[PDB]
Amino acid sequence: VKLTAELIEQAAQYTNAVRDRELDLRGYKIPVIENLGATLDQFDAIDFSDNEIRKLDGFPLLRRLKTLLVNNNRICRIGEGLDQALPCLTELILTNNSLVELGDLDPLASLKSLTYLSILRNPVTNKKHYRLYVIYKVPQVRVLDFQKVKLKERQEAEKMFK
Amino acid sequence: KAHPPELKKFMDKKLSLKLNGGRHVQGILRGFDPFMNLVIDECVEMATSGQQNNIGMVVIRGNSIIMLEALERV
Amino acid sequence: MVQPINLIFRYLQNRSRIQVWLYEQVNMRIEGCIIGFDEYMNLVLDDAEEIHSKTKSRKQLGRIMLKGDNITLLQSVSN
Amino acid sequence: GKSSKMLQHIDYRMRCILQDGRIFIGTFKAFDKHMNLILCDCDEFREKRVLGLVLLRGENLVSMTVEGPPP
Amino acid sequence: SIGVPIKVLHEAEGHIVTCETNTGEVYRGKLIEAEDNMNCQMSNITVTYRDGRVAQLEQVYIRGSKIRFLILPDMLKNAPMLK
Amino acid sequence: SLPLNPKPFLNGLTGKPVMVKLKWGMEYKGYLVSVDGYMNMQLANTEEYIDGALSGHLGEVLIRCNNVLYIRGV
Amino acid sequence: MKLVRFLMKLSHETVTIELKNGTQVHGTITGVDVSMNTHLKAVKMTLKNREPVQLETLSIRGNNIRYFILPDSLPLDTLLVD
Amino acid sequence: REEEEFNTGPLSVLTQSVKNNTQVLINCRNNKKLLGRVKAFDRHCNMVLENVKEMWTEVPKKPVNKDRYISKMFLRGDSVIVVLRNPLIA
RNA sequence: GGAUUUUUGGAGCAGGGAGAUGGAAUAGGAGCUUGCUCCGUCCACUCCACGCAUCGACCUGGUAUUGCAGUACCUCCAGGAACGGUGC
């Protein structure tokens, strides 16, 4: 059950709780996120929860994409061309993923408009100084794992590994 | 057509009207009109510095009427 | 209930000096004696004067036919 | 003659541009002779502003175009 | 003689709505009187403008000449507004 | 004197040198040739005046009612 | 006599419309109403100090249109006969 | 009634532009002056003209003036501010 | 069916003054390249008049509320002022 144009044209699309145009693509078990050109950047949020996506890549240019729900998936790697395809990506929910190393968070630093990031329920969050490395690598993010970044955490991230 | 505005409840009540260009007046309405023209007897207009100047009975047309707020409980 | 047309007719019968403010123009106003009126609020002022509040000057013109689409507020003065 | 210019875009998401430079993207449900647009669950872009059901008057309308497929 | 947005605005009288004027003034409150010419008379209204001067007044009256838009709740967008 | 309506005053002002000033600040001075019921003006040998200074002669000039602010009979 | 009947008979023609805000929209006129509601298809709009954008459809009101631009090969003498 | 008012009022100044095929100037609210021959008119001053020349002045945003020419155009009566008839075709 | 609430528009235009202040990589003219001098276009800082006052959104610290609802907005104190509009 791969993501095609007929699956995106038959999927439900409505208004979310934040008054944004969201398309519900849950319950599809798509192994790879592709063929997203049929939406023509008419959705403000993408609900791709409960899927089997392994890599968050292969997305076309969508300037209206501001929220991406990748919860309950097996995402273990992030694409390096995420900034060239989503310049206005501000919300990224990557809870309960397959990220084990902090080096997968290195392509996530290119998103300058990203402010809300969720990396909870992951083996990469259980490593030593994971939050300090995420604050040092991504200074544009203001809320990490439902927690506001303070000045002391930014000073601790800028002190170590400088 | 040509229905008059519902100004029967705001009759003989002290209200503040706003006019275009940032003008503010306060006075008691003495009548109504289908062209939204209001007659304010003993009206006082607010200047730029904040002083109130009494202009007496004035007539405000509906082409520049922005908002009328009733200062009395009707 | 006092009608605005009846008030304009009483002001034209009394021949008192009235000042008319323009729409979207607070710097310059007109002042004169309204002689007659019409359905489109067209005022005919005799020996009218344009008063500029910024420069504090007064320029007389005489018989002026002011349209009702530009006059926003009209007040009665003692002068 | 047919007057089907406004009926073909009924129940669809359209983005109308205002005179001051604002853009309201909403689902056009009904119209009138004064071009009164009723945009249910509309978004305001110029930043995103949560508005919802916005009834904009026809005097502040400039242009309107199709935004996407109907929900 | 009566429009469908005019009928939707007349049917939404008594609910917590808002009216944004052409100058940016947002009069919010319960729509007590709504005529066919977009005349909105509200009681216990609140002024939240584009200037931001938020205040509370006992009664307000905004005409349809300088009215830019109206924000209404979505309780009447289902029925009988489905055509 | 007697209350004169503006329409016979505009009908009797034809052929006399008047000056019509618009809302943009410019005025046209000339002999009033044509004046209809929609408050439109058509003059001959018109001269343009801006900020109290003459600009030039144009001839027959037609001014609508939506732009003309006032008119004074000289 | 009436310009609305002349504007309504100018369908399927590539024209341009300049608004009061400086935005020029060039496209094929497909629908004209009595209130000069110009409904065009595959238009290109250029605003003041902005980039031109191509749209599949556009609907401009009559009160917002300031000027129009017709091609030189338009039969204005034949279309004027009512 | 309407024809006599159009041939005897200010609209006759427009009617002398289409009958004798004379050139008149129209100054708009956008600080532009278009000189041309009036081909079609109406009661709402909808002027459809041919062979028009529009001149104005622009700033870089010193400024400078500019001009252009159009084969056939149509302008509504709302944006028409000033209309001047002068013997410029001869 | 162009005369006040919708469609023949009341819209257009310009951002205070000064200083031997600083820059036009590839884009001004003149004294007929380059170097220099003069004059009608910005941004950054400083001074006078942080252009002024207002309220809303917002950041730091302290502090109060533990409450079952369908919402313009919601505790208070102090500092800073990146944003919006109102009148001069």
Short mmCIF file of all heavy atoms in Angstrom, two decimals, chain A residues 66-149, unseen atoms left out:
data_model
loop_
_atom_site.label_atom_id
_atom_site.label_comp_id
_atom_site.label_asym_id
_atom_site.label_seq_id
_atom_site.Cartn_x
_atom_site.Cartn_y
_atom_site.Cartn_z
N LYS A 66 3.53 23.32 7.02
CA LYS A 66 4.06 23.85 8.27
C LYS A 66 4.07 22.84 9.41
O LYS A 66 4.80 23.05 10.38
N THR A 67 3.28 21.77 9.32
CA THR A 67 3.22 20.76 10.37
C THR A 67 3.31 19.37 9.74
O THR A 67 2.65 19.10 8.73
N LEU A 68 4.12 18.51 10.34
CA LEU A 68 4.33 17.15 9.85
C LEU A 68 4.23 16.19 11.03
O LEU A 68 5.04 16.27 11.96
N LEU A 69 3.25 15.30 10.99
CA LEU A 69 3.03 14.31 12.04
C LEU A 69 3.61 12.98 11.58
O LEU A 69 3.08 12.34 10.66
N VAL A 70 4.70 12.55 12.22
CA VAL A 70 5.36 11.30 11.87
C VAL A 70 5.39 10.40 13.10
O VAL A 70 6.33 9.61 13.27
N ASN A 71 4.38 10.51 13.95
CA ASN A 71 4.32 9.70 15.16
C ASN A 71 3.95 8.26 14.84
O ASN A 71 3.28 7.98 13.84
N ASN A 72 4.40 7.35 15.71
CA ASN A 72 4.17 5.90 15.62
C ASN A 72 4.68 5.33 14.29
O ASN A 72 3.96 4.65 13.56
N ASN A 73 5.94 5.62 13.99
CA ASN A 73 6.56 5.15 12.75
C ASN A 73 7.92 4.53 13.03
O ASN A 73 8.31 4.35 14.19
N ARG A 74 8.66 4.20 11.97
CA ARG A 74 9.98 3.61 12.07
C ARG A 74 11.02 4.48 11.36
O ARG A 74 11.88 3.99 10.63
N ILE A 75 10.94 5.79 11.57
CA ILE A 75 11.85 6.73 10.94
C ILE A 75 13.19 6.69 11.67
O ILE A 75 13.27 6.98 12.87
N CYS A 76 14.25 6.32 10.94
CA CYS A 76 15.58 6.23 11.51
C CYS A 76 16.59 7.16 10.86
O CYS A 76 17.71 7.28 11.37
N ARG A 77 16.23 7.83 9.76
CA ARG A 77 17.14 8.74 9.08
C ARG A 77 16.34 9.91 8.52
O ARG A 77 15.18 9.77 8.14
N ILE A 78 16.99 11.07 8.48
CA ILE A 78 16.38 12.30 7.99
C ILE A 78 17.12 12.73 6.72
O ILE A 78 18.35 12.63 6.64
N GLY A 79 16.36 13.20 5.74
CA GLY A 79 16.96 13.63 4.49
C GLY A 79 17.64 14.98 4.62
O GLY A 79 17.21 15.85 5.39
N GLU A 80 18.71 15.16 3.86
CA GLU A 80 19.47 16.41 3.88
C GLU A 80 18.79 17.51 3.08
O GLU A 80 19.12 18.69 3.28
N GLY A 81 17.87 17.17 2.19
CA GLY A 81 17.19 18.17 1.39
C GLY A 81 15.83 18.55 1.95
O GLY A 81 14.89 18.82 1.19
N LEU A 82 15.72 18.59 3.28
CA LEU A 82 14.46 18.95 3.91
C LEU A 82 14.21 20.46 3.87
O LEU A 82 13.05 20.88 3.82
N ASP A 83 15.27 21.27 3.89
CA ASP A 83 15.11 22.71 3.82
C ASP A 83 14.75 23.19 2.42
O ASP A 83 14.05 24.20 2.28
N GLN A 84 15.21 22.49 1.39
CA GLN A 84 14.90 22.87 0.02
C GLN A 84 13.49 22.47 -0.40
O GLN A 84 12.99 22.99 -1.40
N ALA A 85 12.85 21.56 0.34
CA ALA A 85 11.50 21.12 0.02
C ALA A 85 10.44 21.67 0.95
O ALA A 85 9.27 21.74 0.55
N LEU A 86 10.80 22.07 2.17
CA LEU A 86 9.86 22.64 3.12
C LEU A 86 10.52 23.80 3.84
O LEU A 86 11.10 23.63 4.93
N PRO A 87 10.48 25.01 3.26
CA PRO A 87 11.12 26.16 3.90
C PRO A 87 10.33 26.69 5.09
O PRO A 87 10.90 27.33 5.98
CB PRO A 87 11.19 27.19 2.77
CG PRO A 87 10.05 26.85 1.88
CD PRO A 87 9.91 25.35 1.94
N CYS A 88 9.02 26.43 5.11
CA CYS A 88 8.14 26.92 6.16
C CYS A 88 7.74 25.82 7.14
O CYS A 88 6.71 25.94 7.81
N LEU A 89 8.54 24.76 7.25
CA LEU A 89 8.26 23.68 8.19
C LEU A 89 8.60 24.13 9.60
O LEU A 89 9.78 24.34 9.92
N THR A 90 7.58 24.27 10.44
CA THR A 90 7.77 24.74 11.81
C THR A 90 7.45 23.69 12.87
O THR A 90 8.01 23.74 13.96
N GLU A 91 6.56 22.74 12.57
CA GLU A 91 6.16 21.71 13.51
C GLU A 91 6.58 20.35 12.97
O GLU A 91 6.21 19.99 11.84
N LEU A 92 7.35 19.61 13.76
CA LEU A 92 7.82 18.28 13.39
C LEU A 92 7.65 17.36 14.59
O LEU A 92 8.36 17.50 15.59
N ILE A 93 6.71 16.42 14.49
CA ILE A 93 6.43 15.47 15.56
C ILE A 93 7.02 14.13 15.13
O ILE A 93 6.47 13.44 14.27
N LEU A 94 8.15 13.77 15.73
CA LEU A 94 8.85 12.52 15.44
C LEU A 94 8.90 11.62 16.67
O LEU A 94 9.91 10.96 16.94
N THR A 95 7.81 11.59 17.43
CA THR A 95 7.75 10.75 18.61
C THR A 95 7.55 9.29 18.23
O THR A 95 6.86 8.97 17.26
N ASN A 96 8.17 8.41 19.03
CA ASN A 96 8.15 6.95 18.86
C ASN A 96 8.66 6.54 17.47
O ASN A 96 7.94 5.95 16.66
N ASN A 97 9.92 6.87 17.22
CA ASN A 97 10.57 6.59 15.94
C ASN A 97 11.74 5.62 16.17
O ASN A 97 11.95 5.12 17.28
N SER A 98 12.50 5.38 15.11
CA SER A 98 13.64 4.46 15.15
C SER A 98 14.97 5.19 15.17
O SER A 98 16.00 4.62 14.79
N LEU A 99 14.99 6.45 15.61
CA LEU A 99 16.22 7.22 15.70
C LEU A 99 17.02 6.75 16.91
O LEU A 99 16.53 6.81 18.05
N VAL A 100 18.24 6.28 16.67
CA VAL A 100 19.09 5.74 17.72
C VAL A 100 20.30 6.64 17.98
O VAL A 100 20.74 6.79 19.12
N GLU A 101 20.85 7.24 16.93
CA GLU A 101 22.03 8.09 17.05
C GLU A 101 21.66 9.56 16.91
O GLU A 101 20.62 9.90 16.35
N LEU A 102 22.53 10.42 17.45
CA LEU A 102 22.30 11.86 17.34
C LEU A 102 22.67 12.38 15.95
O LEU A 102 22.24 13.48 15.57
N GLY A 103 23.45 11.61 15.19
CA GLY A 103 23.87 12.02 13.86
C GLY A 103 22.75 12.12 12.85
O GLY A 103 22.91 12.77 11.81
N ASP A 104 21.61 11.48 13.12
CA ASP A 104 20.43 11.67 12.29
C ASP A 104 19.79 13.03 12.49
O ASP A 104 19.01 13.47 11.64
N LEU A 105 20.10 13.72 13.60
CA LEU A 105 19.59 15.06 13.85
C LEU A 105 20.40 16.14 13.14
O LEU A 105 20.03 17.32 13.22
N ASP A 106 21.49 15.78 12.47
CA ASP A 106 22.33 16.73 11.74
C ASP A 106 21.69 17.26 10.44
O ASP A 106 21.90 18.45 10.14
N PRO A 107 20.93 16.49 9.64
CA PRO A 107 20.15 17.14 8.58
C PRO A 107 18.97 17.96 9.08
O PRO A 107 18.41 18.74 8.30
CB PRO A 107 19.68 15.97 7.71
CG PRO A 107 20.65 14.91 7.95
CD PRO A 107 20.99 15.03 9.39
N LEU A 108 18.56 17.80 10.34
CA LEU A 108 17.46 18.59 10.89
C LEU A 108 17.86 20.01 11.25
O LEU A 108 16.99 20.82 11.57
N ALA A 109 19.16 20.33 11.21
CA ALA A 109 19.61 21.68 11.54
C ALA A 109 19.40 22.66 10.39
O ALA A 109 19.50 23.87 10.60
N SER A 110 19.13 22.16 9.18
CA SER A 110 18.93 23.04 8.03
C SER A 110 17.58 23.74 8.06
O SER A 110 17.41 24.76 7.39
N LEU A 111 16.62 23.23 8.83
CA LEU A 111 15.30 23.84 8.94
C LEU A 111 15.39 25.03 9.89
O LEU A 111 15.35 24.87 11.11
N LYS A 112 15.53 26.23 9.32
CA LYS A 112 15.64 27.43 10.14
C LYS A 112 14.30 27.87 10.71
O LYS A 112 14.27 28.55 11.74
N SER A 113 13.20 27.49 10.07
CA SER A 113 11.87 27.85 10.53
C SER A 113 11.30 26.87 11.54
O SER A 113 10.19 27.09 12.04
N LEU A 114 12.02 25.79 11.85
CA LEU A 114 11.53 24.79 12.79
C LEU A 114 11.66 25.32 14.22
O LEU A 114 12.75 25.72 14.64
N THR A 115 10.55 25.31 14.95
CA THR A 115 10.52 25.77 16.33
C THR A 115 10.01 24.74 17.32
O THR A 115 10.40 24.79 18.49
N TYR A 116 9.17 23.81 16.89
CA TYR A 116 8.61 22.77 17.75
C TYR A 116 9.07 21.41 17.25
O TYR A 116 8.73 21.02 16.12
N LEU A 117 9.84 20.70 18.07
CA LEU A 117 10.35 19.38 17.73
C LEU A 117 10.05 18.41 18.86
O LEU A 117 10.17 18.76 20.04
N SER A 118 9.66 17.19 18.50
CA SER A 118 9.34 16.14 19.45
C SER A 118 10.19 14.92 19.14
O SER A 118 10.05 14.33 18.06
N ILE A 119 11.06 14.54 20.07
CA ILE A 119 11.94 13.39 19.88
C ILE A 119 11.79 12.44 21.06
O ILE A 119 12.72 11.70 21.40
N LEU A 120 10.61 12.43 21.67
CA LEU A 120 10.35 11.57 22.81
C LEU A 120 10.10 10.13 22.35
O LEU A 120 9.81 9.87 21.18
N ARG A 121 10.23 9.20 23.31
CA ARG A 121 10.05 7.76 23.12
C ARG A 121 10.97 7.21 22.03
O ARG A 121 10.56 6.42 21.18
N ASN A 122 12.23 7.62 22.07
CA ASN A 122 13.22 7.22 21.09
C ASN A 122 14.51 6.82 21.80
O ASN A 122 14.82 7.36 22.87
N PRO A 123 15.27 5.87 21.24
CA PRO A 123 16.56 5.52 21.84
C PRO A 123 17.62 6.61 21.73
O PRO A 123 18.61 6.56 22.48
CB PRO A 123 16.99 4.26 21.07
CG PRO A 123 15.71 3.71 20.52
CD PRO A 123 14.87 4.91 20.20
N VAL A 124 17.45 7.57 20.82
CA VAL A 124 18.42 8.67 20.72
C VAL A 124 18.26 9.64 21.88
O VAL A 124 19.22 10.31 22.27
N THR A 125 17.05 9.73 22.46
CA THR A 125 16.84 10.60 23.60
C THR A 125 17.40 10.01 24.89
O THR A 125 17.61 10.75 25.86
N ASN A 126 17.64 8.70 24.93
CA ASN A 126 18.20 8.05 26.11
C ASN A 126 19.72 8.15 26.19
O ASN A 126 20.30 7.71 27.19
N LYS A 127 20.37 8.71 25.17
CA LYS A 127 21.81 8.85 25.18
C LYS A 127 22.23 10.01 26.08
O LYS A 127 21.42 10.83 26.51
N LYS A 128 23.53 10.07 26.37
CA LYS A 128 24.06 11.11 27.24
C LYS A 128 24.15 12.43 26.49
O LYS A 128 24.66 12.49 25.37
N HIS A 129 23.64 13.49 27.13
CA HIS A 129 23.64 14.87 26.62
C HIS A 129 22.93 14.98 25.27
O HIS A 129 23.40 15.65 24.35
N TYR A 130 21.78 14.31 25.15
CA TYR A 130 21.02 14.36 23.91
C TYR A 130 20.29 15.69 23.76
O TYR A 130 20.22 16.25 22.66
N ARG A 131 19.73 16.21 24.86
CA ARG A 131 19.02 17.48 24.80
C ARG A 131 19.97 18.65 24.59
O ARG A 131 19.64 19.60 23.86
N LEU A 132 21.16 18.59 25.18
CA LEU A 132 22.16 19.63 24.97
C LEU A 132 22.69 19.61 23.54
O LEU A 132 22.91 20.67 22.94
N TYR A 133 22.86 18.41 22.97
CA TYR A 133 23.28 18.31 21.58
C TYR A 133 22.19 18.77 20.62
O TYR A 133 22.48 19.36 19.58
N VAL A 134 20.92 18.52 20.97
CA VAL A 134 19.82 18.99 20.13
C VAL A 134 19.65 20.50 20.23
O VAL A 134 19.23 21.15 19.27
N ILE A 135 19.98 21.08 21.39
CA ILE A 135 19.91 22.53 21.54
C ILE A 135 21.08 23.20 20.84
O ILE A 135 20.94 24.31 20.30
N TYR A 136 22.25 22.56 20.85
CA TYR A 136 23.42 23.14 20.20
C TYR A 136 23.35 23.01 18.68
O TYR A 136 23.75 23.93 17.96
N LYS A 137 22.85 21.88 18.18
CA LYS A 137 22.76 21.68 16.74
C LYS A 137 21.60 22.45 16.12
O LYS A 137 21.72 22.93 14.99
N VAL A 138 20.49 22.57 16.83
CA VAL A 138 19.32 23.28 16.32
C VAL A 138 18.98 24.44 17.25
O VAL A 138 18.14 24.28 18.15
N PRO A 139 19.60 25.61 17.09
CA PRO A 139 19.27 26.75 17.96
C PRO A 139 17.94 27.41 17.63
O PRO A 139 17.41 28.14 18.47
CB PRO A 139 20.43 27.72 17.73
CG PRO A 139 20.89 27.41 16.34
CD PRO A 139 20.70 25.93 16.16
N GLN A 140 17.38 27.16 16.44
CA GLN A 140 16.12 27.78 16.06
C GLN A 140 14.92 27.13 16.74
O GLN A 140 13.84 27.73 16.77
N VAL A 141 15.07 25.92 17.26
CA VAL A 141 13.97 25.22 17.93
C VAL A 141 13.78 25.83 19.31
O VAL A 141 14.73 25.95 20.09
N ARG A 142 12.53 26.20 19.62
CA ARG A 142 12.20 26.80 20.91
C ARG A 142 11.56 25.82 21.88
O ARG A 142 11.74 25.97 23.09
N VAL A 143 10.83 24.83 21.38
CA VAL A 143 10.17 23.83 22.22
C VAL A 143 10.67 22.46 21.79
O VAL A 143 10.44 22.04 20.65
N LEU A 144 11.34 21.77 22.70
CA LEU A 144 11.89 20.44 22.46
C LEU A 144 11.29 19.47 23.47
O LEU A 144 11.53 19.62 24.67
N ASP A 145 10.53 18.49 22.97
CA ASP A 145 9.86 17.45 23.77
C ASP A 145 8.93 18.06 24.82
O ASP A 145 8.97 17.70 26.00
N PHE A 146 8.09 19.01 24.36
CA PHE A 146 7.11 19.73 25.18
C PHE A 146 7.76 20.46 26.35
O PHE A 146 7.23 20.49 27.46
N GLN A 147 8.93 21.05 26.09
CA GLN A 147 9.66 21.79 27.11
C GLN A 147 10.29 23.03 26.48
O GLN A 147 10.91 22.94 25.42
N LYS A 148 10.11 24.17 27.14
CA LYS A 148 10.66 25.43 26.63
C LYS A 148 12.15 25.51 26.91
O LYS A 148 12.60 25.22 28.03
N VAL A 149 12.92 25.89 25.90
CA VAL A 149 14.37 26.02 26.04
C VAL A 149 14.68 27.31 26.78
O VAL A 149 14.23 28.39 26.39
#
